[PDB]
From a paper:
Acetyl-CoA synthetase (Acs) generates acetyl-coenzyme A (Ac-CoA) but its excessive activity can deplete ATP and lead to a growth arrest. To prevent this, Acs is regulated through Ac-CoA-dependent feedback inhibition executed by Ac-CoA-dependent acetyltransferases such as AcuA in Bacillus subtilis. AcuA acetylates the catalytic lysine of AcsA turning the synthetase inactive.
AcsA and AcuA contribute 1,859.8 Å2 and 1,861.9 Å2 of solvent accessible area, respectively, to the interface of the complex. First, the very C-terminus of AcuA (amino acids 203 – 210) reaches out into the active site of the AcsA NTD. A detailed analysis revealed that the main chains of AcuA_M209 and Y208 form hydrogen bonds with AcsA_D255, while the main chain of AcuA_Y210 forms a hydrogen bond with AcsA_R108. Additionally, a loop containing the catalytic residue K549 within the CTD of AcsA aligns with the active site of AcuA. The cryo-EM structure of the complex shows that the very C-terminus of AcuA inserts into the CoA-binding site of the NTD of AcsA. The AcsA domain arrangement enforced by the binding of AcuA appears unsuitable for a productive synthesis of Ac-CoA catalyzed by AcsA and may thus be considered as the “locked” state.
Residue numbers in the entry:
A (entry chain C): 4 to 210
B (entry chain B): 3 to 452, 467 to 559
C (entry chain A): 5 to 452
Write the structure that this text describes.
């Protein structure tokens, strides 16, 4: 189940309202941000946002200014073909697009978005995971190097208290920068923890 | 690629060339007790020989995990292995040439059980917990093993009723209900005594069983002989560089072959100090292990090293890693990047070692007493004639593709593929050249030789016709791997062969010669998760 | 007369070595004979950690709670950590008396080695003393630093000691006062490398106080160079081969546990075993059976108390690993010899010395016949005699005073700040008198 939550932040550009889990009909009525094309064109992530908002377990948290959406965080279930969803079950939600608009970045927008997202207890019955790679990031938009970029997301994503986890994914390990962020909920089962431990390390015989 | 210069020191293989020219297995066998006595056993010479020598009070096992930090010496390890062998003989009804299987995670009891099983002559076969019920059931069905030791978390994964030849199932720890064929280890060791009347073996009977997931879908049981122990010792003397003061840490699991011979037998045949780190992988735990334990010799795999680099070098800088002396990698051709990272962090060099299950113990190894080429496995150990052969068994001059073969006759061989002499005779080639199925080649010196997708991916987006793409490495027999890209064009652009070459030249001029894609395929859209992330494992699985 | 057993001993022939030994042959054994920098602590532990004994287990620790084991490298690292803590948080300099008031634990050995490593004179303290004894010992020694556990924290009157700057507390939560610092939260905030204060041949490193009938505490000072003898007897009396497990059951607050539980076995590079908690015969025999102790240096009181438990307790355990067992600082009884021979199948060697002598002088040897109830014979390089008041060497088989020719490596430097008492131990003529009465034998045996 879902309980609505909200909070407000203030900056030079005005007041930003961070709606928590929100009903899909209202997202269908917002106006997208033209600058926020980190993953897909606006149409495609609009379809994604409404679809996950319609899922019983998928959730969307939106930080916005007025009637225009500027940042979103998704909690969609892991991709069925992806190895993290081999069980294809429950209590496993993959965090996806968390990035915000370029010129609103540096305003503590992402950390506030994640904290407003994560204070909910329904964030904590399920553990949260996300997989980050170097090619998904703005290489030239902000013009700073690899490891500082990883460190600054570790800082900005520690707002939810997420600790870094290691995995043997051939895709993750192709570059030491690409890694896996995740949180372990306080209401989750120990069997779920062992299951996630098994899932993270597929071919453990090598180490 | 620049060869790593050697470091002067009190090594064991003073001169590799002179030994390779004048090495006989007789002097190697002279290092063993059976050469004078005639009583031979691999487990004996790995444990008891040192437990009776001056290494009796020397730390043999360094066990650390999230809960336990236990330490065992050679005398204590001998006592534990003898107790395990006693309990296996008394309860498991095991005799010479039998099959005893291991279903355990990393723990001292695993090594105790396997050493005890080998000591009584029972052929030991390890297993991995990641296997489902099907894999373990198939392995015991093929092996017809009488005994399988297990853990309570995995007791439910073995079909005891299904297997007719399976007789006893041992469980270790916890509180498992004592069924008709389910006996708990802990008590069975508790009242059982220590002293073991070790049964002495011939040169040509087996002591290790290992099942490898074959291409046909069914595993095969490789049976190594006690003679292999000879080779192990010498390798554990030369490539592993175990001196009398070295702390050796092997990160491989004992369920695999690599953690069975060079994580168990090779270090202890030289009387060294093995380190075992249980529990989940965590770079904090590994770096703390190296720091406070003072690991000198390291034997790990490129996957674990790559995950350690993924952790971050600052976390390594949080600990003291200057105690390292000698680093080695097994299980996959070492990357030069891992070599550079290891040299930068630990100030020590890593050495890739090659061998597989059908090989028994490592043959072609990078050597601390010679210049190290990071991309090369190394040179064959003395007394072992490794080379490159074609499909006809004829030798081939260096610097050309070919199938790596070994001159049959070396002590470390499979005595059989269990209940499958056909797969035996398929492994060896006419002319006495055992074939391992791997591709390799040598160079003039005598060493042997077996890409970031994002830089191509970032290059692709610069076209005004493509919005996104995915690049994978398609395996190649000539260049190793060829670059293949799947392209989803933007609106107003149609797939064609004319524009395919335009992508190749633009990448060619803007990037390296080998960075240009060799295969281009067009899609309406690439596989993407619901959020928008592009995964490439599905792309290579499709290809 | 229990006959000697044929075997490979470090001392091959007693007479040949006795008649043709010079202490330079013992000096060349050490690592400072070619480098000059000499320190007892460096060669007890730090030398082996850079040798082929680095991974050999140096300390077995057992008690009712902890069952960890330490190698020579581990002891070196932990002792360097303790010495760094002492130097930084106590400002203890060369010659400063660092007193240690804490129960049997690995931290005790780490702190003792660290104190001796930085040149400080380490003074052990037994836990059985009540407030006055520790108070007067600390006052007389003018100890700059004391290290203790909270259970004994209230026993030291810090307010009554002007010369006590800092007090270290080990274990538990102890409020960090101005002059009270808890070790543990200072233990893990520095490095494990410690520069060892090298000093000359004549400079003290141990301060042991002996209880006396007078009641005043007497702190003898042993120079570093006493180790010259400490190692040698450890190779002859203890015959510490490379594959022996050594168990010293004497308390480390006393000189015997301090030098024959720390310096004598580790200088030879042996494997020391130590068990915590209150004694119980099952605990000791189980320690023997599990660890398989080869050399067992214990006190005769401990042997009598073990005999009181009965031989059936020993029969329940495996004692075939014992090969060399010895008794400390008391006249062994023939009954103890017989009991040890039937229950361990091995011979006990009674050795004699005192805090003033610093190390064993007259002992039994494995390559030598044993007459029960006898001291044995002096180690080669040490001349012993039976002198009267006038000091003429008395022929054997007559009552007299034990004396040893002065100048042997283990000679004391002085009694702390009491030169008159130091000179009272010596009789003109090159003879030191230990205050014990004994007589010699034609072969050379010594008897009370």
């Amino acid at each position: 189940h879902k309980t609505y939550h909200s909070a407000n932040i203030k900056t030079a550009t005005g007041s930003l309202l961070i709606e928590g889990p929100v009903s899909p009909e209202d997202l269908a009525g917002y106006e997208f941000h033209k600058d926020l094309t980190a993953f897909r064109p606006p149409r495609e992530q609009h379809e994604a946002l409404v679809d996950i908002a319609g899922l019983p377990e998928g959730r969307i948290i939106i930080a916005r200014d007025g009637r225009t959406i500027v940042g979103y965080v998704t909690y969609l279930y892991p991709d069925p073909l992806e190895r993290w969803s081999e069980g294809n079950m429950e209590d496993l939600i993959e965090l996806g697009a968390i990035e915000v608009a370029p010129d609103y970045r540096g305003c503590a927008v992402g950390k506030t978005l994640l904290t407003v997202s994560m204070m909910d207890e329904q964030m904590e019955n399920y553990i949260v995971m996300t997989t980050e790679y170097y090619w998904h990031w703005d290489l030239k938009g902000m013009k700073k190097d690899v490891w500082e970029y990883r460190k600054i997301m570790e800082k900005m994503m520690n707002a939810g208290g997420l600790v870094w986890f290691a995995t043997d994914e051939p895709e993750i390990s192709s570059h030491p920068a690409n890694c896996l962020m995740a949180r372990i909920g306080k209401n989750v089962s120990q069997e779920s923890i062992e299951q996630f431990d098994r899932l993270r390390f597929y071919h453990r015989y090598m180490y | 690629l620049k060869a790593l210069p050697a470091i002067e020191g009190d090594h064991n293989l003073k001169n590799y060339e002179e030994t390779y020219r004048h090495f006989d297995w007789a002097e190697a066998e002279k290092h063993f007790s059976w050469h004078e006595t005639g009583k031979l056993n691999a487990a004996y010479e790995a444990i008891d020989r040192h437990a009776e020598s001056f290494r009796k009070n020397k730390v043999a096992l360094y066990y650390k995990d999230a809960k336990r930090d236990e330490k065992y010496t050679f005398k204590e390890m001998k006592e534990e292995s003898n107790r395990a062998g006693n309990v296996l003989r008394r309860y498991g009804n095991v005799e010479k040439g039998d099959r005893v299987f291991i279903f355990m995670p990393r723990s001292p009891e695993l090594y105790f059980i396997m050493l005890g099983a080998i000591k009584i002559g029972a052929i030991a076969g390890p297993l991995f917990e990641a296997f489902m019920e099907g894999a373990v059931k198939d392995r015991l069905e093929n092996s017809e093993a009488k005994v399988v030791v297990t853990t309570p978390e995995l007791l439910e994964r073995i079909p005891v009723d299904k297997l007719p030849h399976l007789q006893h199932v041992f469980v270790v720890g916890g509180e498992a209900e004592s069924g008709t064929n389910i006996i708990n280890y802990d008590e069975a060791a508790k009242q059982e005594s220590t002293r073991l009347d070790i049964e002495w073996m011939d040169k040509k009977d087996g002591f290790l069983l290992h099942y490898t997931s074959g291409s046909t879908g069914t595993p095969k049981g490789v049976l190594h002989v006690h003679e292999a122990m000879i080779q192990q010792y010498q390798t554990g003397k030369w490539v592993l560089d175990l001196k009398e003061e070295d702390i050796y840490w092997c990160t491989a699991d004992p369920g695999w072959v690599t953690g069975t011979v060079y994580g168990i037998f090779a270090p202890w045949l030289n009387g060294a100090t093995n380190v075992i780190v249980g529990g989940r992988f965590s770079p904090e735990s590994w770096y703390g292990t190296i720091e406070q334990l003072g690991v000198n010799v390291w034997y790990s795999a490129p996957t674990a090293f790559r995950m350690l680099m993924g952790a971050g070098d600052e976390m390594a800088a949080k600990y003291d890693l200057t105690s390292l002396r000698h680093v080695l990698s097994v299980g996959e051709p070492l990357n030069p990047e891992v070599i550079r990272w290891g040299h930068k962090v630990f100030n020590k060099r890593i050495h890739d070692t090659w061998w597989m299950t059908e090989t028994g113990s490592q043959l072609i190894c990078n050597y601390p007493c010679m210049d190290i080429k990071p991309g090369s496995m190394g040179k064959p150990i003395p007394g072992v004639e490794a080379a490159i052969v074609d499909n006809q068994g004829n030798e081939l001059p260096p610097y050309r593709m070919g199938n790596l073969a070994i001159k049959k006759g070396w002590p470390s061989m499979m005595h059989t593929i269990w209940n499958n002499p056909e797969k035996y005779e398929s492994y060896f080639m006419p002319g006495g050249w055992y074939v391992s199925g791997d591709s390799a080649y040598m160079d003039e010196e005598g060493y042997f030789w077996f890409v970031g997708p994002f830089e191509v991916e970032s290059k692709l987006v610069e076209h005004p016709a493509i919005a996104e793409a995915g690049v994978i490495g398609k395996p190649d027999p000539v260049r190793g791997e060829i670059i293949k890209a799947f392209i989803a064009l933007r609106e107003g652009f149609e797939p064609s062969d004319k524009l395919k070459e335009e992508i190749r030249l633009f990448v060619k001029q803007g990037l390296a010669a080998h960075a240009a894609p060799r295969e281009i395929e067009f899609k309406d859209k690439l596989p993407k998760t619901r959020s928008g992330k592009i995964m490439r494992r599905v792309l290579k699985a499709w290809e």
